[PDB]
Coordinates of C-alpha atoms and ligand atoms in Angstrom, one line a residue:
Chain S
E610 CA 6.6 -0.5 -8.8
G611 CA 4.6 2.4 -9.6
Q612 CA 0.8 2.1 -9.1
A613 CA -0.2 0.6 -5.7
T614 CA -1.5 -2.9 -6.0
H615 CA -0.5 -4.4 -2.3
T616 CA -1.8 -1.8 0.1
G617 CA -5.8 -0.2 0.9
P618 CA -7.8 -0.9 -1.4
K619 CA -5.7 -1.3 -4.5
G620 CA -4.7 -4.0 -2.5
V621 CA -7.4 -5.9 -2.4
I622 CA -8.2 -4.8 -5.9
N623 CA -5.0 -6.6 -7.0
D624 CA -5.3 -9.4 -4.5
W625 CA -8.7 -10.4 -5.9
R626 CA -7.5 -9.9 -9.9
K627 CA -4.5 -13.2 -8.8
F628 CA -6.6 -15.0 -6.9
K629 CA -8.8 -16.0 -9.9
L630 CA -5.3 -15.9 -12.3
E631 CA -5.0 -19.0 -10.6
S632 CA -8.8 -19.2 -9.5
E633 CA -10.1 -20.5 -13.2
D634 CA -7.8 -24.0 -12.5
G635 CA -4.9 -23.1 -14.1
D636 CA -2.4 -20.1 -14.5
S637 CA -0.1 -19.2 -17.2
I638 CA -1.5 -22.0 -18.6
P639 CA -3.5 -23.0 -22.1
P640 CA -6.4 -23.1 -19.6
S641 CA -6.3 -19.3 -18.6
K642 CA -6.0 -16.2 -21.6
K643 CA -4.3 -18.4 -24.8
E644 CA -4.9 -14.4 -26.8
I645 CA -0.8 -13.7 -25.0
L646 CA -3.8 -10.7 -24.1
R647 CA -3.1 -10.5 -20.4
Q648 CA -2.1 -11.9 -18.1
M649 CA -4.5 -11.2 -16.3
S650 CA -7.9 -8.7 -17.2
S651 CA -7.0 -5.3 -15.4
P652 CA -7.3 -0.9 -15.3
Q653 CA -6.0 1.6 -15.6
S654 CA -2.6 1.0 -18.0
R655 CA -3.1 2.9 -20.7
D656 CA -4.5 6.8 -20.1
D657 CA -7.0 7.2 -22.1
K658 CA -7.2 11.2 -22.5
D659 CA -10.5 11.6 -23.9
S660 CA -12.6 13.7 -20.2
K661 CA -9.1 15.6 -19.6
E662 CA -7.5 12.6 -17.3
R663 CA -4.8 9.3 -17.4
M664 CA -7.8 7.4 -16.8
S665 CA -8.4 5.7 -13.8
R666 CA -11.7 2.9 -13.0
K667 CA -9.9 0.4 -11.0
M668 CA -12.4 -1.7 -10.9
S669 CA -14.4 -1.3 -15.1
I670 CA -17.4 -3.6 -15.7
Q671 CA -16.4 -6.5 -17.2
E672 CA -15.0 -7.3 -13.1
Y673 CA -17.9 -6.0 -10.9
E674 CA -19.4 -8.9 -13.5
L675 CA -17.8 -11.5 -12.6
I676 CA -18.1 -10.3 -8.6
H677 CA -21.7 -11.2 -9.3
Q678 CA -21.5 -13.8 -11.5
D679 CA -18.7 -16.1 -9.1
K680 CA -18.3 -18.8 -7.9
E681 CA -16.2 -18.4 -5.1
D682 CA -15.4 -21.6 -4.0
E683 CA -14.1 -21.3 0.3
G684 CA -11.8 -24.1 -0.4
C685 CA -10.0 -23.0 -3.3
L686 CA -9.9 -19.2 -0.6
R687 CA -7.9 -20.6 2.1
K688 CA -5.2 -22.1 -0.1
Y689 CA -4.7 -18.6 -1.3
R690 CA -4.4 -17.0 1.5
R691 CA -1.8 -19.8 2.5
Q692 CA -0.2 -19.1 -0.5
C693 CA -0.3 -15.3 -0.7
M694 CA 1.9 -15.8 3.2
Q695 CA 4.6 -18.2 1.7
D696 CA 4.5 -16.1 -1.8
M697 CA 5.2 -12.7 0.3
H698 CA 8.1 -15.3 3.0
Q699 CA 10.4 -16.2 -0.6
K700 CA 10.8 -12.9 -1.9
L701 CA 11.7 -11.7 1.8
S702 CA 13.8 -14.8 2.4
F703 CA 17.1 -13.9 0.9
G704 CA 20.2 -16.7 0.7
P705 CA 22.3 -17.4 4.3
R706 CA 24.6 -15.9 3.5
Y707 CA 27.2 -14.5 6.2
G708 CA 27.5 -16.2 9.3
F709 CA 30.0 -14.0 10.8
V710 CA 31.0 -11.0 12.7
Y711 CA 33.8 -9.2 10.5
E712 CA 35.6 -6.7 12.1
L713 CA 36.1 -3.6 10.1
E714 CA 39.6 -1.6 11.4
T715 CA 38.7 1.9 9.2
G716 CA 35.9 4.5 8.4
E717 CA 37.0 3.6 4.8
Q718 CA 35.4 0.1 5.2
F719 CA 32.7 0.9 7.5
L720 CA 31.5 3.6 5.2
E721 CA 32.0 0.7 1.7
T722 CA 30.0 -2.0 3.4
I723 CA 26.6 0.1 3.4
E724 CA 27.6 1.3 0.6
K725 CA 28.4 -1.8 -2.3
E726 CA 26.0 -4.4 0.1
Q727 CA 22.8 -5.4 -1.5
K728 CA 20.2 -2.8 -1.0
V729 CA 17.8 -6.0 0.5
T730 CA 20.4 -6.8 3.1
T731 CA 20.1 -6.1 6.7
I732 CA 23.3 -4.6 8.0
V733 CA 23.7 -4.1 12.1
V734 CA 27.1 -2.6 12.8
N735 CA 29.0 -2.4 16.7
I736 CA 30.9 0.8 17.4
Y737 CA 32.5 -0.7 20.5
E738 CA 35.5 0.0 22.8
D739 CA 37.4 -2.7 24.6
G740 CA 37.7 -3.5 28.4
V741 CA 34.1 -0.4 28.3
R742 CA 31.1 -3.0 30.0
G743 CA 29.0 -4.3 27.7
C744 CA 31.2 -4.6 25.2
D745 CA 32.1 -8.6 25.8
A746 CA 28.3 -9.5 26.8
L747 CA 27.0 -7.4 23.2
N748 CA 30.2 -8.7 20.9
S749 CA 29.3 -12.7 22.2
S750 CA 25.4 -12.0 21.8
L751 CA 25.8 -10.7 18.1
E752 CA 28.3 -14.0 16.6
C753 CA 25.9 -16.6 18.1
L754 CA 23.2 -14.5 16.3
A755 CA 25.8 -13.9 13.5
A756 CA 25.5 -17.2 13.1
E757 CA 22.2 -17.8 13.0
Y758 CA 20.4 -15.2 10.4
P759 CA 22.6 -15.7 7.7
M760 CA 21.5 -13.9 5.7
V761 CA 22.3 -10.2 8.2
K762 CA 25.4 -8.8 7.5
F763 CA 26.8 -8.5 11.4
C764 CA 30.2 -5.7 11.5
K765 CA 32.0 -4.7 14.8
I766 CA 34.5 -1.8 15.1
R767 CA 36.4 0.2 18.3
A768 CA 35.2 3.3 18.6
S769 CA 38.8 4.3 17.4
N770 CA 38.9 3.2 14.5
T771 CA 35.6 5.2 13.1
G772 CA 37.5 8.7 12.5
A773 CA 35.1 10.7 14.5
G774 CA 36.5 10.2 17.7
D775 CA 35.4 12.3 21.1
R776 CA 32.0 11.5 19.4
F777 CA 32.1 8.4 20.4
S778 CA 33.0 7.9 24.1
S779 CA 32.3 5.9 27.3
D780 CA 29.8 6.9 27.4
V781 CA 27.0 6.5 25.0
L782 CA 29.4 2.9 24.2
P783 CA 27.8 0.1 23.2
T784 CA 26.1 2.6 19.9
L785 CA 24.1 -0.2 17.4
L786 CA 23.2 1.5 14.3
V787 CA 21.8 -0.8 11.2
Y788 CA 21.7 0.0 8.2
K789 CA 19.1 -2.0 5.2
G790 CA 18.9 -0.5 1.8
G791 CA 22.2 2.2 2.1
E792 CA 20.2 4.3 5.2
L793 CA 20.1 3.8 8.5
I794 CA 17.2 2.5 9.6
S795 CA 18.5 2.0 13.4
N796 CA 21.1 3.7 16.1
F797 CA 21.0 2.8 19.5
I798 CA 22.8 4.8 22.0
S799 CA 23.8 2.7 25.6
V800 CA 22.4 -0.4 23.8
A801 CA 23.3 -2.3 26.5
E802 CA 20.9 -0.5 28.0
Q803 CA 18.3 -2.3 26.8
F804 CA 19.4 -5.4 28.8
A805 CA 20.0 -6.5 32.3
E806 CA 23.9 -6.3 33.1
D807 CA 23.5 -10.5 32.6
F808 CA 22.7 -10.5 29.0
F809 CA 22.7 -13.0 25.9
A810 CA 22.0 -13.6 21.9
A811 CA 18.6 -14.2 22.9
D812 CA 17.7 -11.2 25.0
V813 CA 19.6 -9.4 22.1
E814 CA 18.0 -11.0 19.6
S815 CA 13.9 -10.6 21.8
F816 CA 14.7 -7.0 21.8
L817 CA 15.7 -6.0 17.7
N818 CA 13.0 -8.4 16.7
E819 CA 11.2 -5.9 18.4
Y820 CA 11.4 -3.1 16.1
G821 CA 11.7 -5.2 13.9
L822 CA 14.6 -5.5 12.3
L823 CA 15.6 -9.0 12.0
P824 CA 14.0 -11.5 9.8
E825 CA 12.2 -14.1 9.2
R826 CA 9.4 -13.6 11.3
Chain E
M813 CA -33.6 18.0 2.4
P814 CA -29.6 16.2 1.3
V815 CA -29.6 15.3 -2.0
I816 CA -29.7 12.7 -3.5
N817 CA -28.5 11.7 -6.9
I818 CA -28.2 8.3 -9.5
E819 CA -24.1 8.6 -12.0
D820 CA -26.2 8.1 -15.1
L821 CA -25.4 11.4 -15.7
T822 CA -24.4 12.4 -19.5
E823 CA -21.0 14.1 -20.0
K824 CA -21.7 17.6 -20.8
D825 CA -24.4 16.7 -17.6
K826 CA -21.0 16.0 -15.7
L827 CA -18.4 18.3 -18.4
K828 CA -21.2 21.5 -17.5
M829 CA -21.2 21.4 -12.9
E830 CA -17.1 21.1 -13.7
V831 CA -17.4 24.2 -14.4
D832 CA -20.5 25.7 -12.6
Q833 CA -17.9 24.0 -9.8
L834 CA -14.7 25.9 -10.2
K835 CA -16.5 29.0 -10.6
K836 CA -17.0 29.3 -7.0
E837 CA -14.5 27.4 -6.5
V838 CA -13.4 31.1 -8.5
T839 CA -15.6 33.1 -6.4
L840 CA -12.6 32.1 -3.3
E841 CA -11.3 34.5 -0.8
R842 CA -7.3 33.0 0.1
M843 CA -5.7 33.9 2.5
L844 CA -1.3 33.6 2.2
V845 CA 0.6 30.6 2.6
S846 CA 2.6 32.0 4.6
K847 CA 0.1 33.1 7.1
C848 CA -1.2 29.3 7.2
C849 CA 1.9 28.5 8.4
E850 CA 3.0 30.1 10.2
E851 CA 0.1 28.8 12.6
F852 CA 0.9 25.5 11.9
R853 CA 4.4 25.6 12.9
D854 CA 2.5 27.5 15.8
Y855 CA -0.3 24.6 16.6
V856 CA 3.1 21.5 15.9
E857 CA 5.4 23.8 18.0
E858 CA 3.8 24.7 20.8
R859 CA 2.3 20.5 21.2
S860 CA 4.8 18.1 20.3
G861 CA 6.5 18.4 23.5
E862 CA 3.6 16.2 24.7
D863 CA 3.5 14.0 22.0
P864 CA 3.3 10.6 23.1
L865 CA 5.4 9.6 20.0
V866 CA 7.9 12.4 19.6
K867 CA 9.3 12.5 23.2
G868 CA 8.9 8.7 24.5
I869 CA 6.9 7.1 27.8
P870 CA 7.8 7.4 30.7
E871 CA 7.4 3.2 31.0
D872 CA 5.4 3.9 33.9
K873 CA 2.9 5.7 31.9
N874 CA 2.9 3.4 29.4
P875 CA -0.2 1.4 29.0
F876 CA 1.2 -0.9 26.4
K877 CA 3.9 -2.1 29.6
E878 CA 5.7 -4.7 29.5
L879 CA 2.9 -7.3 30.6
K880 CA 2.7 -8.7 34.0
Chain Z
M1072 CA -25.1 19.2 -34.6
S1073 CA -24.0 19.7 -31.0
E1074 CA -20.2 20.1 -28.8
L1075 CA -18.5 19.8 -26.3
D1076 CA -15.3 20.8 -27.2
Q1077 CA -16.2 24.6 -25.7
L1078 CA -17.2 23.5 -22.7
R1079 CA -14.3 21.7 -23.1
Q1080 CA -11.9 25.0 -23.1
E1081 CA -13.6 26.5 -19.5
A1082 CA -13.2 24.3 -16.8
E1083 CA -9.4 24.4 -17.8
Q1084 CA -9.3 28.2 -18.4
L1085 CA -11.0 28.2 -15.0
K1086 CA -8.4 25.3 -13.8
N1087 CA -5.4 28.1 -14.7
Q1088 CA -7.3 31.0 -13.4
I1089 CA -8.1 28.7 -10.4
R1090 CA -4.3 28.1 -10.5
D1091 CA -3.5 32.2 -10.5
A1092 CA -5.0 33.1 -7.5
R1093 CA -2.5 30.3 -5.4
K1094 CA -0.2 31.2 -6.7
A1095 CA 0.1 35.2 -6.5
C1096 CA 0.0 33.5 -2.5
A1097 CA 2.8 31.3 -2.9
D1098 CA 5.3 33.0 -1.1
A1099 CA 7.0 30.8 0.4
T1100 CA 7.0 26.9 1.7
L1101 CA 6.6 25.5 4.7
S1102 CA 10.4 24.8 5.0
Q1103 CA 11.1 28.0 5.0
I1104 CA 9.4 28.9 8.6
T1105 CA 10.9 25.8 10.1
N1106 CA 14.6 26.4 8.7
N1107 CA 15.3 26.9 12.7
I1108 CA 12.6 24.9 14.8
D1109 CA 14.8 22.4 15.7
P1110 CA 14.1 18.7 14.0
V1111 CA 12.4 16.0 16.6
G1112 CA 15.2 13.1 17.8
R1113 CA 15.0 9.9 15.8
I1114 CA 12.0 8.8 16.1
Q1115 CA 12.5 4.7 17.2
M1116 CA 9.4 2.6 18.0
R1117 CA 9.2 -0.5 19.8
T1118 CA 6.5 -3.8 19.9
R1119 CA 5.1 -3.4 23.4
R1120 CA 1.2 -6.6 21.8
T1121 CA 1.3 -9.2 19.3
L1122 CA -2.2 -9.9 18.2
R1123 CA -2.4 -12.8 16.9
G1124 CA -5.7 -14.8 15.5
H1125 CA -6.1 -13.5 12.5
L1126 CA -5.4 -16.1 9.7
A1127 CA -4.6 -14.2 5.9
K1128 CA -3.3 -10.5 5.3
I1129 CA -5.0 -7.8 7.7
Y1130 CA -6.7 -5.3 4.7
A1131 CA -7.6 -2.4 7.3
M1132 CA -7.7 -1.2 10.6
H1133 CA -9.2 1.3 12.8
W1134 CA -8.7 2.2 16.6
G1135 CA -12.3 3.1 18.9
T1136 CA -11.6 6.2 20.7
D1137 CA -10.5 5.0 23.8
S1138 CA -7.7 4.4 22.5
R1139 CA -7.3 0.4 23.6
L1140 CA -10.2 -1.4 21.7
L1141 CA -9.3 -1.6 18.1
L1142 CA -11.4 -3.2 14.9
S1143 CA -9.3 -5.5 12.1
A1144 CA -10.5 -6.3 8.9
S1145 CA -8.8 -9.0 7.4
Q1146 CA -8.4 -11.1 3.2
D1147 CA -9.8 -15.0 5.9
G1148 CA -13.5 -13.2 6.1
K1149 CA -13.1 -11.1 9.3
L1150 CA -13.4 -8.6 11.7
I1151 CA -12.4 -8.6 15.1
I1152 CA -12.1 -6.1 18.1
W1153 CA -9.2 -6.5 20.2
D1154 CA -8.2 -5.0 24.0
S1155 CA -4.8 -3.6 22.4
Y1156 CA -3.7 -3.0 26.5
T1157 CA -4.0 -7.3 26.6
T1158 CA -4.1 -8.9 23.4
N1159 CA -6.7 -11.0 23.9
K1160 CA -9.9 -10.8 21.2
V1161 CA -13.0 -9.3 22.8
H1162 CA -15.2 -10.2 19.3
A1163 CA -14.9 -11.8 15.9
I1164 CA -17.7 -11.7 13.5
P1165 CA -17.5 -13.7 10.3
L1166 CA -18.1 -12.0 6.8
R1167 CA -18.8 -13.2 3.4
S1168 CA -16.2 -11.8 1.7
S1169 CA -12.6 -11.8 2.2
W1170 CA -12.6 -8.3 0.4
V1171 CA -13.1 -6.2 2.5
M1172 CA -10.9 -2.5 2.3
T1173 CA -12.1 -1.1 5.5
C1174 CA -13.7 -1.2 8.1
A1175 CA -15.1 1.9 11.1
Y1176 CA -15.4 1.9 14.7
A1177 CA -17.7 4.4 15.6
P1178 CA -16.7 6.7 18.1
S1179 CA -19.5 5.1 20.7
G1180 CA -17.6 1.2 20.3
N1181 CA -21.7 0.2 19.9
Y1182 CA -21.3 -0.4 16.8
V1183 CA -18.0 -1.0 13.6
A1184 CA -18.6 -1.2 10.5
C1185 CA -16.3 -2.4 7.3
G1186 CA -16.9 -2.8 3.3
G1187 CA -14.9 -4.5 0.3
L1188 CA -15.1 -5.0 -3.9
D1189 CA -18.9 -6.5 -2.4
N1190 CA -20.3 -2.4 -3.1
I1191 CA -21.9 -2.6 0.5
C1192 CA -21.2 -0.9 3.8
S1193 CA -21.8 -3.2 6.4
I1194 CA -23.2 -2.3 9.9
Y1195 CA -22.0 -4.4 13.4
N1196 CA -24.0 -4.2 16.2
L1197 CA -21.8 -5.1 19.5
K1198 CA -24.0 -4.7 21.9
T1199 CA -27.1 -6.3 21.1
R1200 CA -24.5 -8.3 20.2
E1201 CA -24.6 -9.5 16.7
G1202 CA -21.2 -11.7 16.8
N1203 CA -22.8 -14.5 14.6
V1204 CA -25.5 -14.3 12.3
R1205 CA -26.7 -10.8 12.6
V1206 CA -25.2 -7.9 10.5
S1207 CA -27.3 -4.5 11.6
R1208 CA -27.7 -2.8 8.5
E1209 CA -26.7 -3.3 4.9
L1210 CA -26.2 -0.6 3.3
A1211 CA -26.6 -1.1 -0.2
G1212 CA -26.1 1.7 -2.9
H1213 CA -23.0 2.0 -5.2
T1214 CA -21.8 1.2 -8.1
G1215 CA -18.4 0.9 -7.1
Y1216 CA -16.7 -1.3 -4.1
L1217 CA -16.3 0.5 -0.6
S1218 CA -13.0 1.9 -0.3
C1219 CA -13.2 3.9 2.2
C1220 CA -16.1 4.5 5.8
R1221 CA -16.3 6.8 8.8
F1222 CA -18.7 7.4 11.0
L1223 CA -20.5 10.7 12.3
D1224 CA -22.6 8.7 15.5
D1225 CA -24.5 5.9 16.0
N1226 CA -27.2 7.1 12.3
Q1227 CA -24.6 8.2 10.1
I1228 CA -22.0 8.0 8.4
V1229 CA -20.2 8.4 5.4
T1230 CA -19.1 6.3 2.3
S1231 CA -15.7 6.7 -0.5
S1232 CA -16.6 4.5 -3.7
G1233 CA -14.9 3.3 -6.9
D1234 CA -17.7 4.7 -8.1
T1235 CA -16.8 7.6 -8.0
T1236 CA -18.6 8.8 -4.7
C1237 CA -19.2 9.8 -1.3
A1238 CA -22.5 9.2 0.8
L1239 CA -23.4 10.1 3.7
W1240 CA -26.3 7.7 5.4
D1241 CA -28.9 7.4 7.6
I1242 CA -28.3 4.2 9.2
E1243 CA -31.5 4.6 11.1
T1244 CA -32.9 4.4 7.4
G1245 CA -30.4 2.7 5.3
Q1246 CA -31.0 5.0 3.0
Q1247 CA -27.9 7.3 1.3
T1248 CA -29.5 10.6 2.3
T1249 CA -26.6 12.5 1.0
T1250 CA -24.4 12.0 -2.2
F1251 CA -21.3 13.4 -2.8
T1252 CA -20.0 13.8 -6.7
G1253 CA -17.8 15.6 -8.2
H1254 CA -14.7 13.8 -8.3
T1255 CA -13.4 12.5 -11.8
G1256 CA -12.4 9.2 -11.2
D1257 CA -13.1 6.7 -7.9
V1258 CA -13.2 7.9 -4.2
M1259 CA -10.4 5.8 -2.7
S1260 CA -10.5 7.5 1.1
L1261 CA -11.8 9.9 3.3
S1262 CA -11.0 12.4 6.9
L1263 CA -13.0 13.0 9.1
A1264 CA -13.5 16.5 11.0
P1265 CA -12.3 16.8 13.4
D1266 CA -16.2 18.7 14.1
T1267 CA -17.7 16.1 12.2
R1268 CA -19.3 18.9 10.2
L1269 CA -16.9 18.6 7.2
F1270 CA -15.3 16.1 5.8
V1271 CA -12.3 15.4 2.8
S1272 CA -11.6 12.7 -0.2
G1273 CA -8.8 11.4 -1.9
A1274 CA -9.5 10.5 -5.4
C1275 CA -7.9 8.3 -9.4
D1276 CA -8.4 11.7 -10.2
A1277 CA -5.6 13.4 -8.6
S1278 CA -7.7 15.4 -6.4
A1279 CA -9.1 16.4 -2.6
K1280 CA -12.3 17.5 -2.4
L1281 CA -13.2 19.1 1.4
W1282 CA -17.3 17.9 1.2
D1283 CA -19.7 19.8 3.4
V1284 CA -21.7 17.0 5.6
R1285 CA -24.7 19.1 6.2
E1286 CA -24.4 20.8 3.4
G1287 CA -24.3 17.9 0.2
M1288 CA -21.9 20.3 -1.7
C1289 CA -18.0 20.4 -2.5
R1290 CA -16.1 24.1 -0.5
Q1291 CA -12.7 23.0 -2.3
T1292 CA -11.1 20.9 -4.6
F1293 CA -7.8 20.4 -4.0
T1294 CA -4.6 19.7 -6.6
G1295 CA -1.0 19.1 -7.1
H1296 CA 0.0 15.7 -7.4
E1297 CA 0.4 14.5 -11.0
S1298 CA -1.2 10.6 -9.9
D1299 CA -4.0 9.8 -7.7
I1300 CA -4.5 10.0 -4.0
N1301 CA -4.9 6.7 -2.5
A1302 CA -4.8 8.2 1.2
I1303 CA -5.6 11.5 3.3
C1304 CA -6.1 12.4 6.8
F1305 CA -7.2 15.1 8.6
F1306 CA -4.8 17.6 10.5
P1307 CA -5.5 17.5 14.4
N1308 CA -6.6 21.0 13.7
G1309 CA -9.0 21.1 11.4
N1310 CA -7.3 23.7 9.0
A1311 CA -5.4 21.3 6.9
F1312 CA -4.7 17.3 6.2
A1313 CA -2.4 15.6 4.0
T1314 CA -2.6 12.7 1.2
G1315 CA -0.2 10.2 0.3
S1316 CA -0.2 8.6 -3.7
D1317 CA 0.9 7.1 -6.7
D1318 CA 3.7 9.3 -6.5
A1319 CA 5.3 8.9 -4.4
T1320 CA 5.1 12.3 -2.5
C1321 CA 3.1 13.0 0.4
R1322 CA 1.5 17.0 0.4
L1323 CA 0.1 18.9 3.7
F1324 CA -3.0 21.4 2.0
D1325 CA -3.9 24.1 3.9
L1326 CA -7.9 24.4 4.3
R1327 CA -7.3 28.1 4.8
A1328 CA -4.9 28.9 1.6
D1329 CA -6.2 26.4 -1.0
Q1330 CA -3.0 25.2 -1.6
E1331 CA -0.6 22.5 -0.2
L1332 CA 1.7 24.2 1.5
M1333 CA 4.6 20.9 1.5
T1334 CA 5.1 17.9 -0.1
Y1335 CA 7.4 14.8 1.7
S1336 CA 9.4 12.6 -0.8
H1337 CA 13.2 11.1 -1.5
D1338 CA 14.5 10.1 -4.6
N1339 CA 15.1 6.4 -3.0
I1340 CA 11.2 6.4 -2.1
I1341 CA 9.9 5.2 -5.0
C1342 CA 6.7 2.9 -4.2
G1343 CA 2.6 5.1 -4.0
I1344 CA 2.3 5.5 0.1
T1345 CA -1.2 3.9 0.8
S1346 CA -2.0 5.3 4.3
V1347 CA -1.0 8.5 6.3
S1348 CA -1.5 9.4 9.9
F1349 CA -0.3 12.2 11.8
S1350 CA 0.7 12.2 15.6
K1351 CA -1.5 13.7 18.3
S1352 CA 0.6 16.9 17.7
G1353 CA 1.1 16.2 14.5
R1354 CA 4.4 16.9 14.4
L1355 CA 4.8 13.7 13.0
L1356 CA 2.9 12.3 9.7
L1357 CA 3.6 8.6 9.0
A1358 CA 3.6 7.2 6.0
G1359 CA 2.4 3.2 4.5
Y1360 CA 4.9 1.9 1.4
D1361 CA 3.0 -0.1 -1.6
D1362 CA 6.1 -2.1 -0.4
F1363 CA 5.8 -3.0 3.1
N1364 CA 7.1 0.3 5.1
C1365 CA 6.2 2.6 7.0
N1366 CA 8.8 6.1 7.0
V1367 CA 8.5 8.1 9.3
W1368 CA 8.5 12.6 8.4
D1369 CA 8.5 15.9 10.3
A1370 CA 5.8 17.7 9.0
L1371 CA 7.2 20.6 9.9
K1372 CA 10.9 19.5 9.1
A1373 CA 10.4 17.6 5.7
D1374 CA 12.8 15.2 6.2
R1375 CA 12.8 12.2 7.3
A1376 CA 12.7 11.6 11.6
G1377 CA 12.1 7.6 11.8
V1378 CA 10.9 4.5 10.1
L1379 CA 8.3 2.2 11.0
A1380 CA 9.2 -1.2 11.9
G1381 CA 12.3 -1.6 10.7
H1382 CA 11.8 -2.2 7.0
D1383 CA 10.7 -5.3 7.5
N1384 CA 8.3 -5.2 4.4
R1385 CA 5.6 -6.3 6.8
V1386 CA 2.6 -3.4 7.4
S1387 CA -0.6 -3.9 4.9
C1388 CA -2.2 -0.2 7.1
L1389 CA -1.5 2.2 10.0
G1390 CA -3.8 4.2 12.7
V1391 CA -3.0 6.6 15.7
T1392 CA -4.6 5.9 19.1
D1393 CA -6.6 9.5 19.6
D1394 CA -4.6 10.0 22.6
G1395 CA -1.7 9.4 20.7
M1396 CA 0.1 7.6 22.2
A1397 CA 0.7 4.1 20.4
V1398 CA 0.7 3.5 16.9
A1399 CA -1.0 0.2 14.8
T1400 CA -0.2 -1.7 12.2
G1401 CA -1.5 -4.9 10.1
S1402 CA 0.9 -6.8 8.4
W1403 CA 0.3 -9.5 5.3
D1404 CA 1.4 -12.1 7.7
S1405 CA -2.0 -12.1 9.8
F1406 CA -1.1 -10.5 12.4
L1407 CA -1.2 -6.6 13.8
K1408 CA 0.7 -4.9 16.3
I1409 CA 1.2 -1.9 18.2
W1410 CA 3.8 0.9 18.9
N1411 CA 5.3 3.1 21.6
Ligands
GD1005 GD1 22.9 -0.5 33.9
GD1006 GD1 25.7 2.7 32.4
GD1007 GD1 17.5 -17.1 18.8
GD1008 GD1 9.6 -7.2 25.3
GD1009 GD1 11.5 4.8 21.4

């Protein structure tokens, strides 16, 4: 990644640029650069230390130049706007791999799953124990959710099987931990508290969506 | 009398102004980071207990409460 | 024949002199003193409102002083003043450019401003109701894009630009009252001191400059990042500020110390920071990254306290209300959200 190009002013500049890389009426095709000079005109790619700094002028004269000699086609603008959102969803949309809640039996297994997983995958782990109120309803919800969000890996484990006994008393159970990219993104102690006694998969979902833990909209 | 200035100055005109500013900055009396830190910790510690995003908002006291 | 090479050395020796003056006061880091302070609880905010109305990527947003009204600029060429409590839209303003880099809300609520690749800062009077056709004033002057802008009051606004400058304008005459020059690279963002006598700016020369508004000149130049500073924010008490950069780190700078007090980074974090904002008490520093993620930093302990928006790669900009009750996030999917 290095230098920013998606957010803030840098994002606007990069967005305007990519826009032309499609506006001109062909992109990587023969209607754009043939000198294979660039896939686009860019500024601040090689440090010009003539002034004693890693030269950083994001917008060049030729860039600002077009800005005035530009024909911002309203139609070409709306098209571009749709294309950006479509592209982003696509990259955030990874195949529907799973579809089932998997049972982890030992602490080693837990650590192994978050460790060896693709860094882009969200992992919802459910720590519970039978008989404890809320657990069964949560597990039922999860099975329905795992089947709807196949790109999210759902898992469950008895507090007893964690390898941290007393640390997980029925008072904090069920606990729902969420990981992604190797790190813990959320920790919901007594998750059942967030819902009404009788809760179902759509409630659990509304809840996870509100913390932004679920993909695809 | 606020200062208006167009950017068509020469490299040396800019280097000149650079050394000038750098000189003014040299004559600046600084505070020990320690004394700065103690004051930072102080300000934040005594106010974090009331920070809405730190402690959480009681649901009745939340302006964005579940709309009804 | 002339020569500037020597003149290039006095600058470095002087810089070298200031480095030392600083190194003489660097006895310990912030984290040292806060070693016994309890870490905050894991910070987990929830979405309470979803603002629907924009038809494109949200570029920038800014809260109104009442902590209820807020303005958002989008790639759809629209500026929308929302009522966050009800999610209702109060005004909708058609712009001429989709390339809007920033937008501001006058602390009075009478005006709102914005600008981008047009190099202009457009001001909109909300009272005279210029929602459909009118545009109060267009501030022409900068020879580079308009990176940021913040009202001092109704007749005074400060802007930062890709032309290497920052400028203080008189809204009535529409003249560049003051011009703040000094940066050697594109000014990316600015932050007004709470008292509005001072303001700070981040730029692509990897330096943050403290400027006196009333006086019209740079008071100090902070350095430490080896990369572009993309965002800057004043600290609640006016004695410090935070910066975020392409070097994937955030830095806490203390004005009196004239140097960084702390840095916030993790090996797992590799994207540039393009958004920084403090919680009301300043205990929290929220940072938005180029990959659309947002991390909440415990400003005291320098450890991540939490993650805003679950790393859904859906945050493009953010802001904290003055009452410190909520955070707003803009997104590439055209939606804004409010978190508590
Ligand atoms: Gd309950
Ligand atoms: Gd309970
Ligand atoms: Gd569903
Ligand atoms: Gd809700
Ligand atoms: Gd919370």
